[PDB]
Amino acid sequence: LTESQFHDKRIAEELRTLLNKSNVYALAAGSLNPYYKRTIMMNEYRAKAALKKNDFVSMADAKVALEKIYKEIDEIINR
Protein backbone atom coordinates (compact mmCIF):
# COMPACT_ATOMS: atom_id res chain seq x y z
CA LEU A 1 0.00 0.00 0.00
CA THR A 2 1.21 3.53 -0.76
CA GLU A 3 0.60 5.07 2.65
CA SER A 4 2.32 2.01 4.22
CA GLN A 5 5.45 3.21 2.47
CA PHE A 6 4.87 6.63 4.12
CA HIS A 7 4.02 5.33 7.59
CA ASP A 8 7.38 3.47 7.67
CA LYS A 9 9.30 6.65 6.96
CA ARG A 10 7.19 8.24 9.73
CA ILE A 11 7.84 6.04 12.79
CA ALA A 12 11.47 5.65 11.78
CA GLU A 13 11.85 9.41 11.93
CA GLU A 14 9.84 9.71 15.13
CA LEU A 15 11.67 6.80 16.75
CA ARG A 16 15.17 8.14 15.90
CA THR A 17 14.12 11.47 17.34
CA LEU A 18 13.30 9.70 20.64
CA LEU A 19 16.49 7.61 20.49
CA ASN A 20 18.41 10.90 20.32
CA LYS A 21 17.06 11.95 23.72
CA SER A 22 18.27 8.85 25.46
CA ASN A 23 21.63 10.23 26.68
CA VAL A 24 20.01 13.35 28.08
CA TYR A 25 17.66 11.05 29.98
CA ALA A 26 20.33 8.59 31.09
CA LEU A 27 22.22 11.52 32.61
CA ALA A 28 19.16 12.69 34.53
CA ALA A 29 18.48 9.16 35.75
CA GLY A 30 22.11 8.72 36.85
CA SER A 31 21.12 9.73 40.36
CA LEU A 32 17.89 7.66 40.47
CA ASN A 33 17.51 3.93 41.15
CA PRO A 34 18.92 1.70 38.48
CA TYR A 35 15.45 0.69 37.23
CA TYR A 36 15.25 3.96 35.34
CA LYS A 37 18.65 3.73 33.67
CA ARG A 38 18.13 0.05 32.92
CA THR A 39 14.74 0.50 31.34
CA ILE A 40 16.18 3.26 29.13
CA MET A 41 19.01 0.94 28.15
CA MET A 42 16.72 -1.96 27.35
CA ASN A 43 14.25 0.17 25.39
CA GLU A 44 17.20 1.68 23.54
CA TYR A 45 18.24 -1.78 22.39
CA ARG A 46 14.76 -2.63 21.17
CA ALA A 47 14.45 0.69 19.34
CA LYS A 48 17.73 0.22 17.49
CA ALA A 49 16.82 -3.36 16.63
CA ALA A 50 13.49 -2.19 15.23
CA LEU A 51 15.14 0.58 13.15
CA LYS A 52 17.37 -2.07 11.65
CA LYS A 53 14.50 -4.48 10.91
CA ASN A 54 12.58 -1.53 9.48
CA ASP A 55 9.45 -3.27 10.80
CA PHE A 56 6.61 -0.77 11.34
CA VAL A 57 5.16 -2.63 14.34
CA SER A 58 8.44 -3.08 16.24
CA MET A 59 9.27 0.55 15.65
CA ALA A 60 5.85 1.71 16.90
CA ASP A 61 6.12 -0.42 20.05
CA ALA A 62 9.61 0.86 20.85
CA LYS A 63 8.49 4.43 20.34
CA VAL A 64 5.75 3.98 22.93
CA ALA A 65 8.16 2.34 25.35
CA LEU A 66 10.73 5.14 25.25
CA GLU A 67 8.01 7.78 25.63
CA LYS A 68 6.70 5.91 28.66
CA ILE A 69 10.08 5.75 30.44
CA TYR A 70 10.99 9.32 29.54
CA LYS A 71 7.69 10.45 30.99
CA GLU A 72 8.33 8.48 34.22
CA ILE A 73 11.77 10.04 34.58
CA ASP A 74 10.24 13.49 34.01
CA GLU A 75 7.84 12.80 36.89
CA ILE A 76 10.51 11.72 39.46
CA ILE A 77 12.81 14.61 38.62
CA ASN A 78 9.88 17.00 38.89
CA ARG A 79 9.26 16.21 42.56
Side-chain angles (χ1 to χ4, degrees):
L1 309 111
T2 91
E3 63 185 342
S4 266
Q5 62 188 46
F6 126 105
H7 260 148
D8 292 5
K9 281 287 190 286
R10 187 190 57 88
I11 25 79
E13 209 60 65
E14 299 174 6
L15 179 56
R16 289 195 201 96
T17 293
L18 286 174
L19 265 187
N20 294 169
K21 307 178 162 301
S22 70
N23 291 151
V24 162
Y25 273 94
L27 269 47
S31 49
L32 317 161
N33 166 106
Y35 155 87
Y36 300 102
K37 227 164 184 298
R38 174 186 220 135
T39 300
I40 292 176
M41 255 154 282
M42 319 192 293
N43 291 357
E44 175 164 354
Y45 188 79
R46 287 330 174 173
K48 288 177 192 161
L51 242 24
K52 166 137 175 167
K53 281 277 248 188
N54 196 26
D55 170 19
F56 179 99
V57 174
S58 289
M59 298 198 178
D61 288 329
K63 170 180 175 296
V64 176
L66 284 166
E67 269 176 336
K68 182 171 179 260
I69 189 61
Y70 290 168
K71 198 186 181 240
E72 290 179 35
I73 297 177
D74 289 345
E75 200 286 313
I76 314 300
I77 297 297
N78 281 297
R79 303 161 177 178

Coordinates of all heavy atoms in Angstrom, one line a residue:
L1 N 0.8 -1.2 0.0 CA 0.0 0.0 0.0 C 0.9 1.2 0.0 O 2.0 1.2 0.4 CB -1.0 0.0 1.2 CG -1.8 -1.3 1.3 CD1 -1.4 -2.2 2.5 CD2 -3.3 -1.1 1.3
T2 N 0.4 2.4 -0.5 CA 1.2 3.5 -0.8 C 1.3 4.5 0.4 O 2.2 5.4 0.5 CB 0.8 4.3 -2.0 OG1 -0.2 5.3 -1.6 CG2 0.2 3.4 -3.1
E3 N 0.4 4.3 1.4 CA 0.6 5.1 2.7 C 1.5 4.2 3.6 O 2.3 4.8 4.4 CB -0.7 5.5 3.3 CG -1.7 4.4 3.7 CD -3.0 5.0 4.2 OE1 -3.1 6.2 4.5 OE2 -4.0 4.2 4.2
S4 N 1.4 2.9 3.5 CA 2.3 2.0 4.2 C 3.7 2.5 4.0 O 4.5 2.6 4.9 CB 2.2 0.6 3.7 OG 1.3 -0.2 4.5
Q5 N 4.1 2.7 2.8 CA 5.4 3.2 2.5 C 5.7 4.6 3.2 O 6.9 4.9 3.5 CB 5.7 3.3 1.0 CG 4.8 4.2 0.3 CD 4.9 4.2 -1.3 OE1 4.9 3.1 -1.8 NE2 4.9 5.3 -1.9
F6 N 4.7 5.4 3.4 CA 4.9 6.6 4.1 C 5.0 6.4 5.6 O 5.9 6.9 6.3 CB 3.7 7.6 3.8 CG 3.0 8.2 5.0 CD1 3.2 9.5 5.4 CD2 2.0 7.4 5.6 CE1 2.5 10.0 6.5 CE2 1.3 7.9 6.7 CZ 1.5 9.2 7.2
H7 N 4.0 5.7 6.2 CA 4.0 5.3 7.6 C 5.4 4.9 8.0 O 5.9 5.4 9.0 CB 3.0 4.2 7.9 CG 1.7 4.7 8.4 ND1 0.5 4.1 8.2 CD2 1.4 5.7 9.3 CE1 -0.5 4.7 8.8 NE2 0.0 5.7 9.5
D8 N 6.0 4.0 7.3 CA 7.4 3.5 7.7 C 8.4 4.6 7.8 O 9.0 4.7 8.9 CB 7.9 2.5 6.6 CG 7.1 1.2 6.5 OD1 6.1 1.1 7.2 OD2 7.5 0.3 5.7
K9 N 8.5 5.5 6.8 CA 9.3 6.7 7.0 C 9.0 7.4 8.2 O 9.8 8.0 8.9 CB 9.2 7.5 5.7 CG 10.0 7.1 4.5 CD 11.5 7.3 4.8 CE 12.4 7.1 3.5 NZ 12.6 5.7 3.2
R10 N 7.7 7.5 8.6 CA 7.2 8.2 9.7 C 7.6 7.8 11.1 O 8.2 8.5 11.9 CB 5.7 8.4 9.7 CG 5.1 9.4 10.7 CD 3.6 9.4 10.8 NE 3.1 8.0 11.1 CZ 2.9 7.5 12.3 NH1 3.2 8.2 13.4 NH2 2.4 6.3 12.5
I11 N 7.4 6.5 11.5 CA 7.8 6.0 12.8 C 9.3 6.0 12.9 O 9.9 6.3 13.9 CB 7.3 4.7 13.2 CG1 6.9 3.8 12.0 CG2 6.1 4.8 14.2 CD1 8.1 3.2 11.4
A12 N 10.0 5.7 11.8 CA 11.5 5.7 11.8 C 12.0 7.0 12.2 O 12.9 7.1 13.0 CB 12.0 5.2 10.4
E13 N 11.4 8.1 11.6 CA 11.9 9.4 11.9 C 11.5 9.7 13.4 O 12.4 10.2 14.1 CB 11.2 10.4 11.1 CG 12.0 11.7 10.9 CD 13.3 11.4 10.2 OE1 13.3 10.9 9.0 OE2 14.4 11.5 10.9
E14 N 10.3 9.4 13.8 CA 9.8 9.7 15.1 C 10.6 8.9 16.2 O 10.8 9.3 17.3 CB 8.3 9.5 15.2 CG 7.5 10.4 14.3 CD 6.0 10.1 14.3 OE1 5.6 9.2 15.1 OE2 5.3 10.7 13.5
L15 N 10.9 7.7 15.8 CA 11.7 6.8 16.7 C 13.1 7.3 16.9 O 13.6 7.4 18.0 CB 11.6 5.3 16.3 CG 12.4 4.3 17.1 CD1 11.9 4.4 18.5 CD2 12.2 2.9 16.6
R16 N 13.8 7.6 15.8 CA 15.2 8.1 15.9 C 15.2 9.4 16.8 O 16.1 9.6 17.6 CB 15.7 8.5 14.5 CG 16.0 7.3 13.7 CD 16.9 7.7 12.5 NE 16.8 6.7 11.4 CZ 16.0 6.9 10.4 NH1 15.2 7.9 10.2 NH2 15.9 5.9 9.4
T17 N 14.2 10.2 16.6 CA 14.1 11.5 17.3 C 14.1 11.2 18.8 O 14.7 11.9 19.6 CB 12.9 12.3 16.9 OG1 13.2 12.7 15.5 CG2 12.7 13.5 17.8
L18 N 13.3 10.1 19.2 CA 13.3 9.7 20.6 C 14.6 9.0 21.1 O 15.0 9.2 22.2 CB 12.1 8.8 20.9 CG 10.7 9.4 20.9 CD1 9.7 8.4 21.0 CD2 10.6 10.4 22.1
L19 N 15.2 8.2 20.2 CA 16.5 7.6 20.5 C 17.5 8.7 20.8 O 18.3 8.5 21.8 CB 17.0 6.8 19.3 CG 16.6 5.4 19.4 CD1 17.3 4.6 18.3 CD2 17.1 4.9 20.7
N20 N 17.5 9.8 20.1 CA 18.4 10.9 20.3 C 18.3 11.6 21.6 O 19.0 12.5 21.9 CB 18.3 11.9 19.2 CG 18.7 11.4 17.8 OD1 18.5 12.0 16.8 ND2 19.4 10.2 17.9
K21 N 17.2 11.3 22.4 CA 17.1 12.0 23.7 C 17.5 11.0 24.8 O 17.3 11.3 26.0 CB 15.6 12.3 24.0 CG 15.0 13.1 22.9 CD 13.6 13.5 23.1 CE 13.1 14.6 22.2 NZ 14.0 15.8 22.5
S22 N 18.0 9.9 24.5 CA 18.3 8.9 25.5 C 19.5 9.1 26.4 O 19.5 8.8 27.5 CB 18.4 7.5 24.8 OG 19.6 7.4 24.0
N23 N 20.5 9.8 25.8 CA 21.6 10.2 26.7 C 21.2 11.3 27.7 O 21.4 11.1 28.9 CB 22.8 10.7 25.9 CG 23.5 9.6 25.1 OD1 24.1 9.8 24.0 ND2 23.4 8.4 25.6
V24 N 20.6 12.4 27.2 CA 20.0 13.4 28.1 C 19.3 12.7 29.2 O 19.5 13.0 30.4 CB 19.0 14.3 27.4 CG1 18.1 14.9 28.4 CG2 19.7 15.3 26.5
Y25 N 18.5 11.7 28.9 CA 17.7 11.1 30.0 C 18.5 10.1 30.9 O 18.2 10.0 32.1 CB 16.5 10.3 29.4 CG 15.3 11.2 29.2 CD1 15.0 11.9 28.0 CD2 14.4 11.5 30.3 CE1 14.0 12.8 27.9 CE2 13.3 12.3 30.1 CZ 13.1 13.0 28.9 OH 12.1 13.8 28.8
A26 N 19.5 9.4 30.3 CA 20.3 8.6 31.1 C 21.1 9.4 32.1 O 21.2 9.1 33.3 CB 21.3 7.8 30.2
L27 N 21.6 10.6 31.7 CA 22.2 11.5 32.6 C 21.3 11.8 33.8 O 21.7 11.7 34.9 CB 22.6 12.8 31.9 CG 24.0 12.9 31.3 CD1 24.3 11.7 30.5 CD2 24.1 14.2 30.5
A28 N 20.1 12.3 33.5 CA 19.2 12.7 34.5 C 18.8 11.6 35.5 O 18.7 11.8 36.7 CB 17.9 13.2 33.9
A29 N 18.8 10.3 35.0 CA 18.5 9.2 35.8 C 19.7 8.5 36.4 O 19.7 7.4 37.0 CB 17.8 8.1 34.9
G30 N 20.9 9.2 36.2 CA 22.1 8.7 36.8 C 21.9 8.6 38.3 O 22.2 7.6 39.0
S31 N 21.4 9.7 38.9 CA 21.1 9.7 40.4 C 20.1 8.7 40.8 O 20.2 8.1 41.9 CB 20.7 11.1 40.8 OG 19.6 11.6 39.9
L32 N 19.0 8.5 40.0 CA 17.9 7.7 40.5 C 18.3 6.2 40.6 O 19.4 5.8 40.1 CB 16.7 7.8 39.5 CG 16.5 9.2 39.0 CD1 15.7 9.2 37.7 CD2 15.8 10.0 40.1
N33 N 17.4 5.4 41.1 CA 17.5 3.9 41.1 C 17.8 3.3 39.8 O 17.3 3.8 38.8 CB 16.2 3.3 41.7 CG 16.1 1.8 41.5 OD1 16.3 1.1 42.4 ND2 15.9 1.4 40.3
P34 N 18.5 2.2 39.8 CA 18.9 1.7 38.5 C 17.8 1.3 37.6 O 18.0 1.1 36.4 CB 19.8 0.5 38.8 CG 20.2 0.7 40.3 CD 19.0 1.4 40.9
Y35 N 16.6 1.1 38.1 CA 15.5 0.7 37.2 C 15.3 1.7 36.0 O 15.3 1.3 34.9 CB 14.1 0.7 38.0 CG 12.9 0.9 37.2 CD1 12.3 -0.2 36.5 CD2 12.4 2.2 36.9 CE1 11.2 0.0 35.7 CE2 11.3 2.4 36.1 CZ 10.7 1.3 35.5 OH 9.6 1.6 34.8
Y36 N 15.3 2.9 36.4 CA 15.3 4.0 35.3 C 16.3 3.8 34.3 O 16.0 3.6 33.1 CB 15.3 5.3 36.0 CG 14.1 5.5 36.9 CD1 14.3 5.4 38.3 CD2 12.8 5.7 36.4 CE1 13.2 5.5 39.1 CE2 11.7 5.8 37.3 CZ 11.9 5.7 38.6 OH 10.8 5.8 39.5
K37 N 17.6 3.9 34.6 CA 18.7 3.7 33.7 C 18.5 2.4 32.9 O 18.7 2.3 31.7 CB 20.0 3.9 34.3 CG 21.0 4.8 33.6 CD 22.1 5.2 34.5 CE 23.1 6.2 33.8 NZ 23.7 5.6 32.5
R38 N 18.2 1.3 33.6 CA 18.1 0.1 32.9 C 17.0 0.0 31.9 O 17.2 -0.5 30.8 CB 17.9 -1.1 33.9 CG 17.7 -2.4 33.2 CD 17.3 -3.4 34.1 NE 17.9 -4.7 33.8 CZ 18.5 -5.5 34.7 NH1 18.6 -5.1 36.0 NH2 19.0 -6.6 34.4
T39 N 15.9 0.4 32.3 CA 14.7 0.5 31.3 C 15.1 1.3 30.1 O 14.8 0.9 29.0 CB 13.5 1.1 32.0 OG1 13.1 0.3 33.1 CG2 12.4 1.2 31.0
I40 N 15.6 2.5 30.3 CA 16.2 3.3 29.1 C 17.1 2.4 28.3 O 16.9 2.4 27.0 CB 17.0 4.5 29.6 CG1 16.1 5.5 30.2 CG2 17.7 5.1 28.4 CD1 16.9 6.7 30.7
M41 N 18.1 1.7 28.9 CA 19.0 0.9 28.1 C 18.4 -0.2 27.4 O 18.7 -0.5 26.3 CB 20.1 0.5 29.1 CG 21.4 1.2 28.9 SD 22.5 1.2 30.3 CE 21.6 2.4 31.4
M42 N 17.4 -0.9 28.0 CA 16.7 -2.0 27.3 C 15.8 -1.5 26.2 O 15.7 -2.1 25.2 CB 16.0 -2.8 28.4 CG 16.8 -3.0 29.6 SD 16.1 -4.3 30.7 CE 14.6 -3.5 31.3
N43 N 15.1 -0.4 26.4 CA 14.3 0.2 25.4 C 15.1 0.7 24.3 O 14.7 0.7 23.1 CB 13.3 1.2 26.0 CG 12.2 0.6 26.8 OD1 12.1 -0.6 27.0 ND2 11.4 1.5 27.4
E44 N 16.3 1.2 24.6 CA 17.2 1.7 23.5 C 17.6 0.5 22.6 O 17.7 0.7 21.4 CB 18.4 2.4 24.1 CG 19.5 2.8 23.1 CD 20.5 3.8 23.7 OE1 20.3 4.2 24.9 OE2 21.4 4.2 23.0
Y45 N 17.9 -0.6 23.2 CA 18.2 -1.8 22.4 C 17.1 -2.2 21.4 O 17.4 -2.4 20.2 CB 18.6 -3.0 23.3 CG 19.2 -4.1 22.4 CD1 20.5 -4.1 22.0 CD2 18.4 -5.2 22.1 CE1 21.1 -5.1 21.3 CE2 18.9 -6.2 21.3 CZ 20.3 -6.2 20.9 OH 20.8 -7.2 20.1
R46 N 15.9 -2.3 22.0 CA 14.8 -2.6 21.2 C 14.5 -1.6 20.0 O 14.3 -2.0 18.9 CB 13.5 -2.7 22.1 CG 13.4 -3.9 23.0 CD 14.1 -5.2 22.4 NE 14.1 -6.3 23.4 CZ 14.5 -7.5 23.1 NH1 14.9 -7.8 21.9 NH2 14.5 -8.5 24.0
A47 N 14.6 -0.4 20.3 CA 14.5 0.7 19.3 C 15.4 0.5 18.2 O 15.0 0.5 17.0 CB 14.6 2.1 20.0
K48 N 16.7 0.4 18.5 CA 17.7 0.2 17.5 C 17.4 -1.0 16.7 O 17.5 -1.0 15.4 CB 19.1 0.2 18.1 CG 19.6 1.6 18.6 CD 21.0 1.5 19.2 CE 21.4 2.7 19.9 NZ 22.5 2.5 20.9
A49 N 17.1 -2.1 17.3 CA 16.8 -3.4 16.6 C 15.7 -3.2 15.6 O 15.7 -3.6 14.5 CB 16.5 -4.5 17.6
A50 N 14.6 -2.4 16.1 CA 13.5 -2.2 15.2 C 13.8 -1.3 14.0 O 13.3 -1.5 12.9 CB 12.3 -1.6 16.1
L51 N 14.7 -0.3 14.2 CA 15.1 0.6 13.1 C 15.8 -0.2 12.1 O 15.7 0.0 10.9 CB 16.1 1.6 13.7 CG 15.7 3.1 13.6 CD1 14.2 3.3 13.5 CD2 16.3 3.9 14.8
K52 N 16.6 -1.2 12.5 CA 17.4 -2.1 11.7 C 16.4 -3.0 10.9 O 16.5 -3.0 9.6 CB 18.4 -2.9 12.5 CG 18.9 -4.1 11.7 CD 20.4 -4.2 11.9 CE 20.9 -5.5 11.3 NZ 22.4 -5.5 11.2
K53 N 15.5 -3.6 11.6 CA 14.5 -4.5 10.9 C 13.7 -3.7 9.9 O 13.4 -4.1 8.8 CB 13.5 -5.1 11.9 CG 14.1 -6.3 12.7 CD 13.9 -7.6 11.9 CE 12.9 -8.5 12.6 NZ 12.9 -9.8 11.9
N54 N 13.5 -2.4 10.2 CA 12.6 -1.5 9.5 C 11.1 -2.0 9.5 O 10.3 -1.8 8.6 CB 13.1 -1.3 8.1 CG 12.4 -0.1 7.4 OD1 11.9 0.8 8.0 ND2 12.3 -0.2 6.0
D55 N 10.8 -2.7 10.6 CA 9.4 -3.3 10.8 C 8.6 -2.2 11.5 O 8.8 -1.9 12.6 CB 9.5 -4.5 11.6 CG 8.1 -5.0 12.1 OD1 7.1 -4.6 11.4 OD2 8.1 -5.8 13.0
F56 N 7.5 -1.8 10.8 CA 6.6 -0.8 11.3 C 6.1 -1.0 12.7 O 5.9 -0.1 13.5 CB 5.5 -0.5 10.4 CG 4.5 0.6 10.9 CD1 4.6 1.9 10.4 CD2 3.5 0.3 11.8 CE1 3.7 2.9 10.9 CE2 2.7 1.2 12.2 CZ 2.8 2.5 11.8
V57 N 5.7 -2.3 13.0 CA 5.2 -2.6 14.3 C 6.2 -2.5 15.5 O 5.9 -2.0 16.5 CB 4.6 -4.0 14.3 CG1 4.1 -4.5 15.7 CG2 3.4 -4.0 13.3
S58 N 7.3 -3.1 15.3 CA 8.4 -3.1 16.2 C 8.8 -1.6 16.5 O 9.0 -1.2 17.7 CB 9.6 -3.8 15.7 OG 9.4 -5.2 15.7
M59 N 9.0 -0.9 15.5 CA 9.3 0.6 15.7 C 8.2 1.3 16.5 O 8.6 2.1 17.3 CB 9.4 1.2 14.3 CG 10.6 0.6 13.5 SD 11.0 1.8 12.2 CE 12.4 1.0 11.4
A60 N 6.9 1.0 16.2 CA 5.9 1.7 16.9 C 5.8 1.3 18.4 O 5.4 2.1 19.2 CB 4.5 1.5 16.2
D61 N 6.1 0.1 18.7 CA 6.1 -0.4 20.0 C 7.3 0.3 20.8 O 7.1 0.7 22.0 CB 6.3 -1.9 20.1 CG 5.1 -2.7 19.7 OD1 3.9 -2.3 19.9 OD2 5.3 -3.9 19.1
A62 N 8.4 0.3 20.2 CA 9.6 0.9 20.9 C 9.4 2.3 21.1 O 9.8 2.9 22.1 CB 10.9 0.6 20.0
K63 N 8.8 3.0 20.2 CA 8.5 4.4 20.3 C 7.6 4.7 21.6 O 7.8 5.6 22.3 CB 7.9 5.0 19.1 CG 7.4 6.5 19.2 CD 6.8 6.9 17.8 CE 6.2 8.3 17.9 NZ 5.0 8.3 18.8
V64 N 6.6 3.8 21.8 CA 5.7 4.0 22.9 C 6.5 3.7 24.2 O 6.3 4.4 25.2 CB 4.5 3.0 22.9 CG1 3.7 3.1 24.1 CG2 3.7 3.4 21.7
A65 N 7.4 2.7 24.2 CA 8.2 2.3 25.3 C 9.1 3.5 25.8 O 9.0 3.8 27.0 CB 9.0 1.1 25.1
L66 N 9.8 4.0 24.9 CA 10.7 5.1 25.2 C 10.0 6.3 25.8 O 10.4 6.9 26.8 CB 11.6 5.5 24.0 CG 12.7 4.7 23.6 CD1 13.2 5.0 22.2 CD2 13.9 4.7 24.6
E67 N 8.9 6.7 25.1 CA 8.0 7.8 25.6 C 7.5 7.5 27.0 O 7.5 8.5 27.9 CB 6.8 8.0 24.7 CG 7.0 9.0 23.6 CD 5.9 9.1 22.6 OE1 5.1 8.1 22.5 OE2 5.8 10.1 22.0
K68 N 7.1 6.3 27.3 CA 6.7 5.9 28.7 C 7.8 6.2 29.7 O 7.6 6.9 30.7 CB 6.3 4.4 28.7 CG 5.8 4.0 30.0 CD 5.2 2.6 29.9 CE 4.7 2.1 31.3 NZ 5.6 1.2 32.0
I69 N 9.0 5.6 29.5 CA 10.1 5.8 30.4 C 10.5 7.2 30.6 O 10.8 7.7 31.7 CB 11.3 4.8 30.1 CG1 12.3 4.9 31.2 CG2 12.0 5.2 28.8 CD1 11.8 4.4 32.6
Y70 N 10.6 7.9 29.5 CA 11.0 9.3 29.5 C 10.0 10.1 30.4 O 10.4 10.8 31.3 CB 11.0 10.0 28.2 CG 12.1 9.5 27.3 CD1 12.2 9.8 26.0 CD2 13.2 8.7 27.8 CE1 13.2 9.4 25.1 CE2 14.2 8.3 27.0 CZ 14.2 8.6 25.6 OH 15.2 8.2 24.8
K71 N 8.7 9.8 30.2 CA 7.7 10.5 31.0 C 7.8 10.1 32.5 O 7.6 11.0 33.3 CB 6.3 10.0 30.5 CG 5.2 10.9 30.9 CD 3.8 10.3 30.5 CE 2.7 11.2 30.9 NZ 1.7 10.5 31.8
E72 N 8.2 8.9 32.8 CA 8.3 8.5 34.2 C 9.5 9.2 34.9 O 9.5 9.6 36.0 CB 8.6 7.0 34.3 CG 7.4 6.1 34.0 CD 7.7 4.6 34.1 OE1 8.5 4.2 35.0 OE2 7.2 3.8 33.3
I73 N 10.6 9.3 34.1 CA 11.8 10.0 34.6 C 11.5 11.5 34.8 O 11.8 12.1 35.8 CB 13.0 9.9 33.6 CG1 13.3 8.4 33.6 CG2 14.2 10.7 34.1 CD1 14.4 8.1 32.6
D74 N 10.7 12.1 33.8 CA 10.2 13.5 34.0 C 9.5 13.6 35.4 O 9.7 14.6 36.1 CB 9.2 13.9 32.9 CG 9.9 14.1 31.5 OD1 11.1 14.2 31.4 OD2 9.2 14.1 30.5
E75 N 8.6 12.7 35.7 CA 7.8 12.8 36.9 C 8.7 12.8 38.2 O 8.6 13.6 39.0 CB 6.8 11.7 36.9 CG 5.6 12.0 37.9 CD 6.0 11.8 39.4 OE1 6.6 10.8 39.7 OE2 5.6 12.7 40.2
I76 N 9.6 11.8 38.3 CA 10.5 11.7 39.5 C 11.2 13.0 39.6 O 11.1 13.7 40.7 CB 11.6 10.6 39.3 CG1 11.0 9.3 38.8 CG2 12.3 10.4 40.7 CD1 9.9 8.8 39.8
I77 N 12.0 13.4 38.6 CA 12.8 14.6 38.6 C 12.0 15.8 39.0 O 12.5 16.8 39.6 CB 13.4 14.8 37.2 CG1 14.4 13.7 36.9 CG2 14.1 16.2 37.2 CD1 15.5 13.6 37.8
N78 N 10.7 15.8 38.6 CA 9.9 17.0 38.9 C 9.3 17.1 40.3 O 8.6 18.0 40.6 CB 8.8 17.1 37.8 CG 9.4 17.7 36.5 OD1 9.8 18.9 36.5 ND2 9.3 17.0 35.5
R79 N 9.6 16.1 41.1 CA 9.3 16.2 42.6 C 10.2 17.2 43.2 O 9.8 18.1 44.0 CB 9.4 14.9 43.3 CG 8.5 13.8 42.7 CD 9.1 12.4 43.1 NE 8.2 11.3 42.6 CZ 8.5 10.0 42.8 NH1 9.6 9.7 43.5 NH2 7.7 9.1 42.3

